[PDB]
Write a protein that binds this ligand. Structure first.
Ligand SMILES: Nc1ncnc2c1ncn2[C@@H]1O[C@H](CSCC[C@H](N)C(=O)O)[C@@H](O)[C@H]1O
Lengths: 8, 231
């Protein structure tokens, strides 16, 4: 699924 | 030293291939058979996704002297049929679905309703073990699932897909792309690859790029999403 790329 | 700034292939991030696949299968068994389940909490952007996909795909179906046909499409990693319902069934006379999770294919019969009678085959199979029939599909749609295959399996699967295309047929990959490298999600047991890695795999399958488009209007916090049309 679409999902967070997390911390920058 | 030997440790690079980042990884650029799945063999650098996958410790044990058998466990990579078995953990992923277990993960999906535990997900509710709903649109929000398919989209990992992003059910609210399903329409944004579908509408862009339709515009992307319609160019191949409606334009040019060598139009892509509308006889048969294959939905890969189809889940309950979110894409089959709103994108593919309204455009193709017949659709087949393939997914590793049988309970999603079972739910699909309910989810797809009356129009679901035009879903012909419900293949329960991992893509890594699946051979789409030669000369059979106008469009093979692969969305939000490529991260579940190793590089070797993905390359070979795409090669098998190529042989499955009917004249003027296309494969579409629509999936998460990492800004850089190859990133492991150890919760769902999948990877996210950057554009270069994906381009390399496409090339290795003997496929040519017809279009490449970044999905607009998605949530700010998520990986970028790209569509590739191939044949
Ligand atoms: N190795 C594999 N082979 C085939 N399907 C797989 C797979 N690993 C995970 N899947 C399936 O991939 C799907 C990801 S959820 C996305 C579903 C659909 N593509 C959509 O966008 O709505 C799940 O249905 C899961 O069962």
């Amino acid at each position: 699924x679409p999902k967070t790329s997390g911390k920058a | 030293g030997l440790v690079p700034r980042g990884s650029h292939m799945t063999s650098e991030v996958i410790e044990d291939e058998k466990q990579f696949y078995s953990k992923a299968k277990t993960y999906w068994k535990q997900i509710p058979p709903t649109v929000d389940g398919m989209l990992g909490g992003y059910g609210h952007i399903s329409s944004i996704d579908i509408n862009s996909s339709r515009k992307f795909l319609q160019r191949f179906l409606r334009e040019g002297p060598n139009k892509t046909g509308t006889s048969c499409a294959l939905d890969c990693g189809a889940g309950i049929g979110r894409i089959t319902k709103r994108l593919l069934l309204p455009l193709f006379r017949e659709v087949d679905m393939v997914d590793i999770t049988e309970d999603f294919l079972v739910q699909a019969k309910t989810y797809l309703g009356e129009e679901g009678k035009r879903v012909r085959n419900y293949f329960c199979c991992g893509l890594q073990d699946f051979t789409p029939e030669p000369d059979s599909y106008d469009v093979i749609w692969i969305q939000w699932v490529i991260g579940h295959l190793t590089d070797q399996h993905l390359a070979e699967f795409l090669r098998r897909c190529k042989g499955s295309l009917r004249p003027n047929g296309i494969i579409v990959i629509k999936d998460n792309m990492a800004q850089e490298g190859v990133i492991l999600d150890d919760v769902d047991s999948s990877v996210c690859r950057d554009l270069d890695v994906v381009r390399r795999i496409i090339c290795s399958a003997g496929l040519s790029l017809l279009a490449e488009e970044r999905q607009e209007n998605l949530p700010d916090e998520i990986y970028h999403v790209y569509s590739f049309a191939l044949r």
